[PDB]
């Protein structure tokens, strides 16, 4: 668990520990503690139906860029766990969800 402390009204660019071993396709998940988990970003730029324009990702053009999650203006209700389901091309099937990253909002 890697806690990231960001106060209210400030942006947060949360990455994950697994680096890009080639062409990647990450799936960001928001897991509220006890409630149902939800999807944030699939295919690194596509937003599903139910996510507004606050959670944005980075495209995979010109490989060498990192896989992160940009939250512009995080509200008070975004106190949950964030997962980086990294699917690269050279490491095969990734059954594990990775490190459970707990975002801590200050204030």
């Amino acid at each position, epitope marked *: 668990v890697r806690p990231l402390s960001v106060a209210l009204g400030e942006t947060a660019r949360i990455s994950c520990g697994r680096q890009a071993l080639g062409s990647r*396709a990450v799936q960001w*998940y928001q897991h509220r503690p006890g409630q149902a988990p939800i999807l944030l970003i699939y*295919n690194n730029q596509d937003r599903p139906s139910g996510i507004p324009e606050r959670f944005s990702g980075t495209p995979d053009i010109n490989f060498g860029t990192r896989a992160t999650l940009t939250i512009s203006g995080v509200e008070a209700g975004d106190e949950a*766990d964030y997962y980086c389901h990294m*699917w690269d091309s050279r490491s095969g099937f990734s059954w594990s969800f990775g490190g*459970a990253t707990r975002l801590t909002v200050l204030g």
Partner: nanobody
Amino acid sequence: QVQLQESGPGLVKPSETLSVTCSVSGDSMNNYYWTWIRQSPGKGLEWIGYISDRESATYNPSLNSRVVISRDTSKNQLSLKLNSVTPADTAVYYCATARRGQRIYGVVSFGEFFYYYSMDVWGKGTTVTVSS
């Protein structure tokens, strides 16, 4: 839109069968993948296994195929049984649906593509435990 509802026994003993049913309504199982995700209290999320329309009985490495996920298209549910459970397997179990989208980086004729899975619609989950 699909609606996922789950229900289980809630309390198990060691060396038993933890069979939890996850029923769906609204849409059928024609083009909808099915999977189960577990998470122990104090631990992170853990994909234990998935099933497809071709009866893909593939499961997580930690699980080591000790669990079976069954997909019965007659009575429209998704069952997940856990034979020979351990007392250190207390977790809250979520069932979700997946999408087999392929990420193509090279050509498709050589096999330069991989399948990534997006668990879009989830369930609220049941909290099972191992007690005395």
